Amino acid sequence: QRFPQRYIELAIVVDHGMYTKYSSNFKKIRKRVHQMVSNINEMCRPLNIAITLALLDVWSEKDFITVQADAPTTAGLFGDWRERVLLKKKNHDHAQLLTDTNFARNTIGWAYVGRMCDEKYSVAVVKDHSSKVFMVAVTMTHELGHNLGMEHDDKDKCKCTTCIMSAVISDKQSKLFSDCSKDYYQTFLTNDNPQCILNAP
């Protein structure tokens, strides 16, 4: 194994619009979220990161933050709410907000770069932008990669054209991280090495 064992305990929050989209059916929403996690875990195997769903929070009554069109703004409000509320419910390492919001600039996901484990910045926002579970899961994985210090793949650094950190998603998206991404992760483990991901559940 190229990388030492790490663990990411995920919290996934499903907003009220997504709850309504899936017929206000908790069981169906939980199943879809589990399938996404199974895909994220598979994609992280070559990085030797074990992915678990520490917490699922479905906003069945109302949104607890102002989910809005600007994804970065929504991410900041989500990070504040995660630090103030979600982390007090159950400890976890990274949280993603899943929403059906038509984010501005044709955006399907956004996250802070290199802030895994930070109470306010270990978050991502992701649009449930396809009926295909894998297309949404690879978006969650791309944002997780950013939070692990990865930038987009660059042809001068590596040759992969459809890897997870490609600059744009496509219908031929692969489930592999490029050499650019693996090198970014090594840099992250070397320079940052956050403690929360050294902890097994």
Render 32-60 in DSSP notation, one character per residue. HHHHHHHHHHHHTGGGTEEEEEEEEEE-S
Starting at the earlier edge strand, list the strands of the sheet with 6-14.
49-58, 6-14, 94-99, 123-127, 109-111
| Method by which this entry was solved | X-ray
Q: Phi and psi (nearest 5°) for 27?
A: -55, -45
What burial class does residue 157 get, using C-beta atoms within 10 Å of its C-beta: 0-12 exposed, 13-18 middle, 19+ buried?
middle
Is 94 annotated among the ligand-binding residues?
Answer: no
Active site residues: 143
Which residue, chain included where needed, has tokens 């950190």? 165
User: What are the structural domain ranges in the chain?
Assistant: 1-201
Identify any residues that bridge with 111 across adjacent strands, giving them in sequence order.
124
Yes or no: domain 1-201 corresponds to CATH 3.40.50.11540: no
What burial class does residue 108 get, using C-beta atoms within 10 Å of its C-beta: 0-12 exposed, 13-18 middle, 19+ buried?
buried
What burial class does residue 25 get, using C-beta atoms within 10 Å of its C-beta: 0-12 exposed, 13-18 middle, 19+ buried?
exposed
How far is 153 from 172, CA to CA, in rounded Å?
16
Is 131 annotated among the ligand-binding residues?
Answer: no
Is 20 annotated among the ligand-binding residues?
Answer: no
How far is 174 from 27, CA to CA, in rounded Å?
29
Task: Say what the resolution is, in angstroms.
Answer: 1.4
